[PDB]
Amino acid sequence: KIRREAAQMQVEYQETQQAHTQAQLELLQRKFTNKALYSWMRGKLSAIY
Amino acid sequence: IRIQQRTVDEVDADIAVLAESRRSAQNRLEKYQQLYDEDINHGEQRAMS
């Protein structure tokens, strides 16, 4: 039964792993330099060039 | 770290298992030794005589 508890807390460990990887993804999308800025870059540079 | 603490709990639970294994096995040991070294009792030598 202590082994079972250890397995369950391993499950919650990896669940927290998924949680903070999702947090990493969302903060990366919330960063300043992003897809909208880079699309502005590409479009303006293409036309003016 | 919590996982491996639980693992240490597993291993020392196992060594407690083996300690009471010693208790039971040694109990068997003295029972069998008492049976063997006493061998044949005065009632049986009385019957034989």
SS3 of B13-44: the string is: HHHHHHHHHHHHHHHHHHHHHHHHHHCCCHHH
Residues of chain B contacting A6 with CB distance shorter than 8 Å: 3, 6-7, 9-10
Which residues, at least 6 apart from A6, have a Cβ–Cβ distance to it below 8 Å?
Answer: B3, B6, B7, B9, B10
Closest residue in B to A9 (Cα–Cα): B3
A32, B33 contact by CB (below 8 A) = no
Phi and psi at residue A9, to the nearest 5°? -75, -25
Resolution in A: 4.3
- C-alpha closest to that of B6 among A2, A21, A40, A30: A2
Q: List the determination method.
A: cryo-EM
Q: Is A9 on the interface with B (CB under 8 A)?
A: yes
One-letter amino acid at A25 equals L
